[PDB]
Design a protein around this motif. Sequence first.
Motif, mmCIF file in Angstrom:
data_model
loop_
_atom_site.group_PDB
_atom_site.id
_atom_site.type_symbol
_atom_site.label_atom_id
_atom_site.label_comp_id
_atom_site.label_asym_id
_atom_site.label_seq_id
_atom_site.Cartn_x
_atom_site.Cartn_y
_atom_site.Cartn_z
ATOM 1 N N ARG A 53 14.497 -17.952 28.379
ATOM 2 C CA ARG A 53 13.467 -18.960 28.205
ATOM 3 C C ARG A 53 13.363 -19.911 29.395
ATOM 4 N N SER A 113 5.869 -24.555 27.596
ATOM 5 C CA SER A 113 6.859 -24.831 26.556
ATOM 6 C C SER A 113 8.234 -24.345 27.018
ATOM 7 N N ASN A 128 19.679 -27.576 18.686
ATOM 8 C CA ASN A 128 18.429 -26.959 18.266
ATOM 9 C C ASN A 128 18.022 -27.518 16.902
ATOM 10 N N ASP A 157 10.292 -23.144 25.133
ATOM 11 C CA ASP A 157 10.615 -21.950 24.368
ATOM 12 C C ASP A 157 9.861 -20.702 24.849
#
Length: 359
Positions: free
Chosen positions: A104, A83, A300, A85
């Motif tokens: 990240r 991911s 986002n 994130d």
Amino acid sequence: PVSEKQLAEVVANTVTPLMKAQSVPGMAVAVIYQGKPHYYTFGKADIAANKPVTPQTLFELGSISKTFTGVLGGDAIARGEISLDDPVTRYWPQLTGKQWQGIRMLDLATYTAGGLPLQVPDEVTDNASLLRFYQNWQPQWKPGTTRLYANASIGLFGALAVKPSGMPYEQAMTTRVLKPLKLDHTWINVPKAEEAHYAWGYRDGKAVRAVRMLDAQAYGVKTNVQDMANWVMANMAPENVADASLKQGIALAQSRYWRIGSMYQGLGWEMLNWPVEANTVVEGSDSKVALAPLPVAEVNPPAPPVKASWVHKTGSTGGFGSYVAFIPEKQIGIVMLANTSYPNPARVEAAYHILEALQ
């Protein structure tokens, strides 16, 4: 409805003056229009041997390599392997320095980790020295605040993104991106057997080629104009890609993660909203801008691909200069491969002029 005849004129009338002014020995061009590639070749792949450029000539893509990295990482996300994130440290537990907290996978992929430099330094040659380099790095900025174009950023992303798969980067790339798309003449090191097709690059009159880590991910791919045309078509129209994770990965790479002035950062790919005027794109291509640390605005959640986009990437090596751009809304695109590194603004100007003729 521009004809193929007219398109051929526009390409020749643009490229021939460009090659003269920029001292370019050879160029291969593909224009994607009306659902198919149109190929134009000019000049010499090898001056001393008097070999012409053909649709099979291999060119060094330089940093357009990063588009393959971005899509491969997208594919891994779509598989559930990574991911964006996730913290970087999830994929490299030996990276224990606390400056990494809060950085990240997204930040590596999109150059926002906080000042990772353009290059991985030459003393980095193995995992121990890679680790030492990233452990010692002191961020100049907090994560997610400053975009600084960096091989040390996306290169590490590409290495970490393939770890769950268990394959080294070159194998993962070949297996999951190149082979499904029938890109069978796209290479990191060119096999001895394909050497006859490899162009020489030219720098100040000297024939040069790239030397044989994170380089594959950032600038190491070699290909011909046919594979590159088909690469552009896949990215332009992922609806026609059958593999479900690969299709999703292409979209993830053209998603907008950050806004920086008039552009948006994808995974490898960069985007501007269409319509865009030539000066916007050309001025952004100047190295004084493209390599500058600039503030970002987060998107986002990331914005999925916007069809009304100018999607592009420049790439160079010591001896080669290339450019790719496409506009999904219009289903047109271009690939320009050359065996000299001539200024990025000139690449963009020529590409823009050709595509303008079609819109």
